[PDB]
Amino acid sequence: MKTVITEVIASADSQGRFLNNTELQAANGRFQRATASMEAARALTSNADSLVKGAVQEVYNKFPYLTQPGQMGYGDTNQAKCARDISHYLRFITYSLVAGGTGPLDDYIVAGLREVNRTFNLSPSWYIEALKHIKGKVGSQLSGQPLTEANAYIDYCINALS
Amino acid sequence: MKTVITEVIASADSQGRFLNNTELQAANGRFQRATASMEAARALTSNADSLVKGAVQEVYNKFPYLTQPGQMGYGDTNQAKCARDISHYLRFITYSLVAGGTGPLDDYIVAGLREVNRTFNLSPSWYIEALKHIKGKVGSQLSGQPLTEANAYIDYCINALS
Amino acid sequence: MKTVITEVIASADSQGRFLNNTELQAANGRFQRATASMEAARALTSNADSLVKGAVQEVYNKFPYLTQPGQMGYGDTNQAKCARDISHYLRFITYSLVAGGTGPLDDYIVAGLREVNRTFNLSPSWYIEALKHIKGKVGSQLSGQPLTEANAYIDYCINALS
Amino acid sequence: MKTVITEVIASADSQGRFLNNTELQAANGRFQRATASMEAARALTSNADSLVKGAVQEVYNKFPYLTQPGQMGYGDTNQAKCARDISHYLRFITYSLVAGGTGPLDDYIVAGLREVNRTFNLSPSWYIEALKHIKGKVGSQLSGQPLTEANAYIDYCINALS
Amino acid sequence: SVLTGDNQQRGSKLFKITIALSPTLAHHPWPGLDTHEPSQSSYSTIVSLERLLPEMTRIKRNGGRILEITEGE
Amino acid sequence: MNVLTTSSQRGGKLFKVTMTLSPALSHHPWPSLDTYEPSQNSYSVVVPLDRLLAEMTYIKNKGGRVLDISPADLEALGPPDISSVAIPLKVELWAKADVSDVQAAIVAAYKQIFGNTYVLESERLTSAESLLRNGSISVREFVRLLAKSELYKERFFFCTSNNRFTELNFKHFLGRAPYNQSEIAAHLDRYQTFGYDAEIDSYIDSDEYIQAFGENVVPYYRGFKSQSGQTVESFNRMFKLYRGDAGSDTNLNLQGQKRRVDPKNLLRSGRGI
Amino acid sequence: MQDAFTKAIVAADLRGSFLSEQELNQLTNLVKESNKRLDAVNAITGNAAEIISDAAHKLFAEQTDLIRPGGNAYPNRRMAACLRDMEIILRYVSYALLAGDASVLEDRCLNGLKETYVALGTPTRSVARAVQLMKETAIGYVNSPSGVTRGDCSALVNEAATYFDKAAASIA
Amino acid sequence: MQDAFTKAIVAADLRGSFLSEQELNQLTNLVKESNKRLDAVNAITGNAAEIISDAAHKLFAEQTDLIRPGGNAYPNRRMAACLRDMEIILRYVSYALLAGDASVLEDRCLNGLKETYVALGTPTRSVARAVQLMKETAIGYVNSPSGVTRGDCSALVNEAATYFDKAAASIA
Amino acid sequence: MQDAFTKAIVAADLRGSFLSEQELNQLTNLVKESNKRLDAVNAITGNAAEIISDAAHKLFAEQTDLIRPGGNAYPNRRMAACLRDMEIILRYVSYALLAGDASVLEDRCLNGLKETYVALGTPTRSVARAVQLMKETAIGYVNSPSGVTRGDCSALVNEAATYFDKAAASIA
Numbered sequence A, B, C, D: 001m002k003t004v005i006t007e008v009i010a011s012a013d014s015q016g017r018f019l020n021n022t023e024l025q026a027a028n029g030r031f032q033r034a035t036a037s038m039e040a041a042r043a044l045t046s047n048a049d050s051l052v053k054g055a056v057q058e059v060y061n062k063f064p065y066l067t068q069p070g071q072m073g074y075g076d077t078n079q080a081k082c083a084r085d086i087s088h089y090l091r092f093i094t095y096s097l098v099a100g101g102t103g104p105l106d107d108y109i110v111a112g113l114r115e116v117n118r119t120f121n122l123s124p125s126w127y128i129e130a131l132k133h134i135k136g137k138v139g140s141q142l143s144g145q146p147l148t149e150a151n152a153y154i155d156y157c158i159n160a161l162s
Numbered sequence E: 001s002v003l004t005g006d007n008q009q010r011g012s013k014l015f016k017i018t019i020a021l022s023p024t025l026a027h028h029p030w031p032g033l034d035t036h037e038p039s040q041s042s043y044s045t046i047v048s049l050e051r052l053l054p055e056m057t058r059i060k061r062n063g064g065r066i067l068e069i070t071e072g073e
Numbered sequence F: 001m002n003v004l005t006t007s008s009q010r011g012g013k014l015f016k017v018t019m020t021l022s023p024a025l026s027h028h029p030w031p032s033l034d035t036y037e038p039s040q041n042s043y044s045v046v047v048p049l050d051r052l053l054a055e056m057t058y059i060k061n062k063g064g065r066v067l068d069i070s071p072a073d074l075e076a077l078g079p080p081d082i083s084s085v086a087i088p089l090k091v092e093l094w095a096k097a098d099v100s101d102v103q104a105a106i107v108a109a110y111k112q113i114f115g116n117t118y119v120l121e122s123e124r125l126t127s128a129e130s131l132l133r134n135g136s137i138s139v140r141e142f143v144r145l146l147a148k149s150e151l152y153k154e155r156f157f158f159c160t161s162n163n164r165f166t167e168l169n170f171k172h173f174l175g176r177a178p179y180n181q182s183e184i185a186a187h188l189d190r191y192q193t194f195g196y197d198a199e200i201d202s203y204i205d206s207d208e209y210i211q212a213f214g215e216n217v218v219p220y221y222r223g224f225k226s227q228s229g230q231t232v233e234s235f236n237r238m239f240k241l242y243r244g245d246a247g248s249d250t251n252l253n254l255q256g257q258k259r260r261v262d263p264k265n266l267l268r269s270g271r272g273i
Numbered sequence G, H, I: 001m002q003d004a005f006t007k008a009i010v011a012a013d014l015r016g017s018f019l020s021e022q023e024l025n026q027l028t029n030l031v032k033e034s035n036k037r038l039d040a041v042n043a044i045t046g047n048a049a050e051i052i053s054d055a056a057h058k059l060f061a062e063q064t065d066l067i068r069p070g071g072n073a074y075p076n077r078r079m080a081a082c083l084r085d086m087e088i089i090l091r092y093v094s095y096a097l098l099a100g101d102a103s104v105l106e107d108r109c110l111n112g113l114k115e116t117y118v119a120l121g122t123p124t125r126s127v128a129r130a131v132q133l134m135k136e137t138a139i140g141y142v143n144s145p146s147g148v149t150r151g152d153c154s155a156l157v158n159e160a161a162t163y164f165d166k167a168a169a170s171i172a
């Protein structure tokens, strides 16, 4: 899993050398930032649910036809799934903030994203909206660095999805 | 040259990916630290000379026989060299503090250190003393983080030399 | 272990070919030489001790300060070691003469020489003197080819040490 | 080209080291032997022709049918070739003696031997007889080491041919 | 081959594979029919989960078959 | 082209200049628009040092532009001897190898894997050496560790472009030079998605590896001697990729990491995709 | 490799001298801007996908023939390559931007690229246009973000430009 | 790989849940100690060479036979290895210390170490001993530094110990 | 690898001692025989092809089934292998003979050979037989040369035998 701390170790290790000043500097960076990161996570964790509802919803507004019978958005099972999925993404996003690296995101969400989505005919677009809508809401509860952090990670997924 | 900034780029580059939040965190670390680092450099740069004199000197006290005729410490040429050398190490250490990585040290001083020293019969020991004596003096003009930084780098050489 | 005989076998073996005239010629060379080599070994083996005493001694004359308290040459343990070491080198040199290759020297003495010496702060210089002093003594008890052989091997170490 | 001298250089070169005693011993072998080798060559060179006639001839006795019309031994062209060839084989054998290695033989005669012979339907057997007959004659003009050497090389071909 | 440490620098879960060895997999650099070594009819190599698929497929197409798979640890 | 004399009759180092010709610079004596002759789009002259300045300015003042200048001594030198690479030599690491034999494989592996590039004692990799010689790592696995090491990325991959790094890889891991753009393209794509580690694996993983120098044989130069499925041009490419003994792949030299094999040469041997 | 800091060092080294006080003050101030610098980078990376997507659309609208049979972007596989190339260039640019130095970019990303394009027959010119198209879009984001403390980024913006341009030039 | 943070995540993941507030507070406080943590590491790295040098001297004073012909640390070649090994172990330990987790140490370093030692005929006992010798010397530095703000490092010191000990145990 | 000389050394080393005078006298005399030793080897190498050819003929006359469909020496491909193998073993034996030591033979050739043969289904017995057949033929040459100085080679002849036999045994 890729976090700041793991990476410098890795790099040090490959070189076959002790952690010298260079790496510690980097580590320090991760720790200083954490305070902001951590804050952001507490905020997302709390409002989770509400964010999720809002998102799922949004998607339907954006793509009305999904809710029609014979479509994917239609029938509760699918809606349940759709909810689940978004919630899982949020959990990983909170995890990443705390871990201080994209690591958690990469391994759970991103790796294999495409093929999964292809085989089940999930359109990336959808997810994206979900995220965007979220981003917008988050853009109220948070501010300054905490906010900035939240964004970074949210986006990182947008980019991976697209 | 390995500095914090170069490394994360390198790592990013190898994997073939954009610089994401992970690396920036690290970078940030380097920049925050710099203020202390920079201070330390200004302090060494100013007292350079005095440190050098003191060191060279020390070495002779430590190894009297060097100053005897037919030895290495003997005759001005050698003394001049001995001075020069210590100054080179100091210059790279100042460069390192500022660069925010061991890089400068590694490439100028360290790489090839052994063989040079072997072929010209320079005893690492000497250099070491020089450094130690220095470290001791620096341990007055500096304080807190600035100090800590200075040490790190000075040591890094001790370890490389030994 | 590298001796003439082992090598030609090795080379033959690698190519996957029978030992042909080429290699035997080489072998013949070795074994012809042996008579001289063997003689030299008998001479060193006998005077071993005396050579060792003389050497150890020499070193101290050459580097008086070693015998001062707080130094390496000081206190019996160290003297004992110093003796031991020189004796080991001599034993390998005798082995090499007999084996008819540097093999024995390479594997016992040479491989890892540097790092050992670095970590324990043994100055190559010392050993060298020991050897030189030896070489000088040997330059009396022996003559002609026997001598030449003895030298070759003694030197081989000088070069490795330096 | 593989001779004793070239090989030791090669081996020295691979390890990346100076020629030490080991290799010189080997070289010495090659040089001392040369005197015998050289002698043998002078002897073959002189009687060349006579050896060749005798050989070619032999082959025909051994394989009468070759001289019949519609066969390979038949018609002067072929006889001329047959002569040429054996003379070439003899020349390479002489060359090897002087060079002090199989080298010359390997590169001219041996490498590609099979396929040539296959594509033109030259039966190894023939050549062999030629050689054998030769060996027998040589076994008169020479004696002691000179002889031994001559054999080695002659055989080396027999083995390669078969 | 018993792993003295995790062989691979890049890190995942590591599995020890033991294979019967064709001459092709490890031909000796010799003239005539290449011969895999006698001493090791069964090479045994630790492999990251990531490289495990490739390694197996390549082993398969080459004569040799997987005697046994065992997690490295 | 070949230069026939290194120095002018009056003492003077001749330099060989190469330019892209222009209609102004030389034109046929016909009616109609002025054309240079097609076969001399890249023209080459040898000029003394004295006339060099003026000659170059005239070339540039017209539409010309100087592809490259090179001393005629270096030019008009033998194509590199292939003596040492015609028959590589080949190193096998036996199981139960002696201390020495392991050493000799390590050296050979550095030499081939790193180009004549020198590796300093601090650069060398104790840890991966340590694994060989107590078993546990193959020669093939050691090679994969080297091409994963930073030392390798610093030289061949971080300075130059992927297009050069590719052939540079083709040489180190397989004696061969690259054959056809297809190969260069595939590696470039694999690198974009999988990343650097996968690319490296794909050489060692590939069938040419194992089919040749499969396991426990340090890789040696296959090119310079006829290989299966190898275009002839590939054999000439090898002469560009491999210059002499005591010629290296160096990031250290001025404009260190360029492309030995011009992209038009690759396209000759096979263009498509 | 190299970057702003390392560079200044190297210069100093050849003179054989400690860093000038003046010279320190370059670096001192460079540090101060860091935060700005960072956000700039962050903005690019965050929008990467888009930047490209966008630029492409415009490039194909302009040079219709690229996507026509016989053109360089046709067919699919070639089109994919063109998209890939854009990404590569961008990625590097970003790298440079962080380093505060062109070098890194000049090395792997561009040195040799022009010649390749010519041999391939891809119009060096068209590629250069796309590089610019990218530039503009990218700046767009760098310069108009949300939730960042408002201030002046110009200095960085221009340096960004330059990088893009070195690219455009050397390719072209 | 793994470290303190990542670990807690993983746990949380299998439950399928957001991180508990309680759990955050573990990490929150872990952060606060960072500075201490760092200095600890720095101290080891700074003194590395010495730590080993020292430990070795003592190791060989005790087990004279190792350095005698027929022993395991003789001749030079072997001796070299033995030094190298000690160092490695150290290196890892440090890594762990920073990570705040044993894993890295166990997986990269300790795993299979015993068996190696066995196959070679290296006496595992002695190896373990050396590791301890190192431990004590190392703590020595961690705990007695220069220029550091005075405070309590115990918590870290003990964790350090544990790492050393896992090493000692698994080797032994 | 190893050979007579090297070996004695190694032994001496573990005792930690100079070579005993007695021990030298083993080597001293070993040298004296060299010339004989060499010629022995030369004889094998010179006749190699034949030795094998011969042995094979006899092997197949005896065990007719090997060459019948269903046997192990059928078809061609297999036959080839079988010949190749015989040769190899020979090659090694020779090597040993020169070295004055079994090792080389045991380590690079014999070790694991049995098991291989087993896994394949090759009948080890027959292999062993072939080795002997070879032995006898080989001795034949070693012991009956022409144009060599006449004398006693027995000592060498027996050692030769032993090598062949170690082979036979370990395979069998």
Ligand SMILES: *[C@H](C)[C@H]1/C(=C/c2[nH]c(/C=C3N=C(/C=C4\NC(=O)C(CC)=C4C)C(C)=C\3CCC(=O)O)c(CCC(=O)O)c2C)NC(=O)[C@@H]1C
Binding pocket: A059, A066, A072, A073, A074, A078, A079, A081, A082, A083, A085, A088, A089, A108, A109, A116, A120, A122, A126, A127, A130
């Ligand atoms: C929401 C925007 C839309 C929607 C989604 C939806 N998803 C599925 C099925 C799956 N979705 C995923 C996604 C994940 N599962 C994971 O474990 C992870 C990583 C943490 C993710 C991102 C997966 C894997 C599936 C496949 C099967 C499964 O049960 O998980 C469906 C069902 C489609 C099908 O079964 O073919 C749906 C509908 N639902 C909506 O209403 C939106 C349009």
Ligand SMILES: *[C@H](C)[C@H]1/C(=C/c2[nH]c(/C=C3N=C(/C=C4\NC(=O)C(CC)=C4C)C(C)=C\3CCC(=O)O)c(CCC(=O)O)c2C)NC(=O)[C@@H]1C
Binding pocket: B059, B066, B072, B073, B074, B077, B078, B079, B081, B082, B083, B085, B088, B089, B108, B109, B116, B120, B122, B126, B127, B130
């Ligand atoms: C001082 C402790 C002792 C001393 C030093 C001394 N040095 C030399 C010769 C050299 N010193 C160096 C060192 C460096 N040169 C570099 O390029 C670098 C990196 C920046 C270093 C560290 C070098 C390379 C040399 C050799 C070549 C040269 O002439 O510079 C000598 C002269 C020894 C000789 O000529 O063989 C001496 C004496 N002087 C003393 O008396 C102290 C014991």
Ligand SMILES: *[C@H](C)[C@H]1/C(=C/c2[nH]c(/C=C3N=C(/C=C4\NC(=O)C(CC)=C4C)C(C)=C\3CCC(=O)O)c(CCC(=O)O)c2C)NC(=O)[C@@H]1C
Binding pocket: C059, C066, C072, C073, C074, C078, C079, C081, C082, C083, C085, C088, C089, C108, C109, C116, C120, C122, C126, C127, C130, H057, H060, H067, H074, H075, H076, H079
């Ligand atoms: C003699 C000129 C000086 C001296 C030597 C001395 N050596 C050590 C320690 C070691 N020396 C060696 C050397 C060897 N041991 C071997 O087995 C071999 C290869 C066969 C060699 C060449 C080694 C390995 C050591 C390390 C520890 C050990 O004793 O085995 C010391 C002790 C230094 C210490 O504090 O550890 C000394 C003093 N003694 C003198 O007084 C001279 C200056």
Ligand SMILES: *[C@H](C)[C@H]1/C(=C/c2[nH]c(/C=C3N=C(/C=C4\NC(=O)C(CC)=C4C)C(C)=C\3CCC(=O)O)c(CCC(=O)O)c2C)NC(=O)[C@@H]1C
Binding pocket: D059, D066, D072, D073, D074, D078, D079, D081, D082, D083, D085, D088, D108, D109, D116, D120, D122, D126, D127, D130
């Ligand atoms: C003599 C025993 C029999 C014989 C020989 C014969 N040879 C050829 C053809 C060739 N002979 C060789 C041999 C060599 N040429 C070389 O350069 C070398 C290496 C230095 C050797 C050993 C070659 C290469 C050829 C083929 C090309 C050629 O024309 O020379 C023939 C003719 C076969 C044909 O198809 O033309 C013959 C007949 N002739 C006899 O009477 C004996 C049976």
Ligand SMILES: *[C@H](C)[C@H]1/C(=C/c2[nH]c(/C=C3N=C(/C=C4\NC(=O)C(CC)=C4C)C(C)=C\3CCC(=O)O)c(CCC(=O)O)c2C)NC(=O)[C@@H]1C
Binding pocket: F023, F034, F035, F036, F037, F038
């Ligand atoms: C027209 C059908 C297509 C075309 C042609 C075109 N050519 C040029 C420029 C040159 N063409 C040549 C050709 C020759 N030079 C020769 O001497 C010969 C016969 C021996 C040929 C056939 C050359 C050398 C030039 C360059 C220099 C010159 O002017 O002679 C152009 C203009 C290129 C420019 O940008 O300057 C063109 C347009 N290209 C088309 O558009 C048609 C498809």
Ligand SMILES: *[C@H](C)[C@H]1/C(=C/c2[nH]c(/C=C3N=C(/C=C4\NC(=O)C(CC)=C4C)C(C)=C\3CCC(=O)O)c(CCC(=O)O)c2C)NC(=O)[C@@H]1C
Binding pocket: F116, F117, F118, F245, F246, F247, F248, F250, F252, F253
């Ligand atoms: C010393 C007398 C002068 C000198 C030499 C120098 N060389 C390099 C770099 C290289 N030198 C070589 C040399 C060889 N390669 C070979 O394989 C052989 C023969 C087999 C030789 C002699 C090579 C390959 C290199 C490149 C790789 C490397 O890193 O060395 C340098 C360093 C160049 C750099 O800019 O890094 C130097 C300094 N230069 C002097 O100052 C002396 C006059």
Ligand SMILES: *[C@H](C)[C@H]1/C(=C/c2[nH]c(/C=C3N=C(/C=C4\NC(=O)C(CC)=C4C)C(C)=C\3CCC(=O)O)c(CCC(=O)O)c2C)NC(=O)[C@@H]1C
Binding pocket: F161, F162, F163, F164, F184, F185, F186, F188, F189, G066, G072, G073, G077, G078, G079, G081, G082, G083, G085, G086, G088, G108, G109, G110, G113, G116, G120, G121, G122, G123, G126, G127, G130
């Ligand atoms: C897109 C903006 C324009 C375009 C691009 C394009 N490129 C190719 C093919 C290749 N591009 C490269 C170039 C590189 N080599 C390197 O090392 C790097 C990284 C520094 C690059 C970018 C290479 C090697 C190829 C060859 C094949 C491959 O895909 O790798 C194409 C395909 C056309 C062809 O292959 O002939 C295209 C379309 N050209 C346009 O038309 C756009 C304006």
Ligand SMILES: *[C@H](C)[C@H]1/C(=C/c2[nH]c(/C=C3N=C(/C=C4\NC(=O)C(CC)=C4C)C(C)=C\3CCC(=O)O)c(CCC(=O)O)c2C)NC(=O)[C@@H]1C
Binding pocket: A033, A144, A145, A148, B024, B025, B028, G032, G033, G035, G036, G038, G039, G040, G042, G142, G143, G144, G145, G146, G148, G149, G150, G151, G152, G153, G156
């Ligand atoms: C320039 C294109 C835009 C802009 C930037 C701007 N940023 C700040 C201040 C900060 N921005 C950051 C961002 C980071 N610092 C880090 O360490 C990281 C990596 C994790 C990031 C992404 C931070 C922490 C600061 C300091 C606090 C703050 O947010 O203000 C400023 C303020 C001025 C200054 O830094 O000196 C500015 C101007 N503003 C613009 O005009 C553009 C939108």
Ligand SMILES: *[C@H](C)[C@H]1/C(=C/c2[nH]c(/C=C3N=C(/C=C4\NC(=O)C(CC)=C4C)C(C)=C\3CCC(=O)O)c(CCC(=O)O)c2C)NC(=O)[C@@H]1C
Binding pocket: E004, E005, E006, F130, F131, F132, F133, F134, H066, H072, H073, H078, H079, H081, H082, H083, H084, H085, H086, H088, H089, H108, H109, H110, H113, H116, H120, H122, H123, H126, H127, H130
């Ligand atoms: C030193 C305190 C003791 C000692 C050490 C010793 N080790 C070896 C050899 C090896 N030890 C290792 C260790 C590692 N392999 C790994 O992968 C790692 C962790 C990632 C380590 C630390 C290995 C691989 C070897 C074998 C290869 C080698 O040459 O080192 C030896 C030499 C064994 C020999 O007989 O050649 C020694 C001496 N043994 C002692 O005597 C000390 C108690």
Ligand SMILES: *[C@H](C)[C@H]1/C(=C/c2[nH]c(/C=C3N=C(/C=C4\NC(=O)C(CC)=C4C)C(C)=C\3CCC(=O)O)c(CCC(=O)O)c2C)NC(=O)[C@@H]1C
Binding pocket: A021, A024, A025, A028, B033, B144, B145, B148, H032, H033, H035, H036, H038, H039, H040, H042, H142, H143, H144, H145, H148, H149, H150, H151, H152, H153, H156
């Ligand atoms: C613990 C074994 C000893 C000890 C530690 C200690 N350190 C601090 C505080 C700091 N230590 C550092 C060090 C670094 N921070 C970094 O970013 C880097 C890498 C470049 C290092 C090396 C820093 C910055 C701090 C904060 C400021 C300061 O130095 O005081 C404390 C104070 C408490 C705290 O948690 O901040 C302590 C106690 N002190 C001892 O007495 C132990 C022997």
Ligand SMILES: *[C@H](C)[C@H]1/C(=C/c2[nH]c(/C=C3N=C(/C=C4\NC(=O)C(CC)=C4C)C(C)=C\3CCC(=O)O)c(CCC(=O)O)c2C)NC(=O)[C@@H]1C
Binding pocket: E023, E033, E034, E035, E036, E037, E038, I066, I072, I073, I078, I079, I081, I082, I083, I085, I086, I088, I089, I108, I109, I110, I113, I116, I120, I122, I123, I126, I127, I130
């Ligand atoms: C011939 C007297 C008998 C015989 C031989 C035979 N062997 C094989 C296959 C192998 N034999 C070996 C032996 C070695 N390989 C080596 O590398 C070495 C030297 C270190 C030896 C001695 C090996 C490894 C193989 C397996 C792979 C190969 O093809 O070489 C066969 C064929 C087995 C098959 O089924 O392919 C045979 C026939 N068996 C007999 O029938 C004879 C009595």
Ligand SMILES: *[C@H](C)[C@H]1/C(=C/c2[nH]c(/C=C3N=C(/C=C4\NC(=O)C(CC)=C4C)C(C)=C\3CCC(=O)O)c(CCC(=O)O)c2C)NC(=O)[C@@H]1C
Binding pocket: C024, C025, C028, D033, D144, D145, D148, I032, I033, I034, I035, I036, I038, I039, I040, I042, I142, I143, I144, I145, I148, I149, I150, I151, I152, I153, I156
């Ligand atoms: C023993 C199996 C049969 C035998 C051998 C024998 N040889 C000699 C003497 C010598 N043999 C050689 C041969 C070589 N010396 C070399 O350097 C090489 C490789 C280039 C060879 C092959 C030599 C030179 C001698 C010395 C005298 C001579 O010219 O022969 C003897 C005599 C005893 C002795 O060693 O001096 C013997 C007995 N002869 C037989 O009848 C045995 C059946």
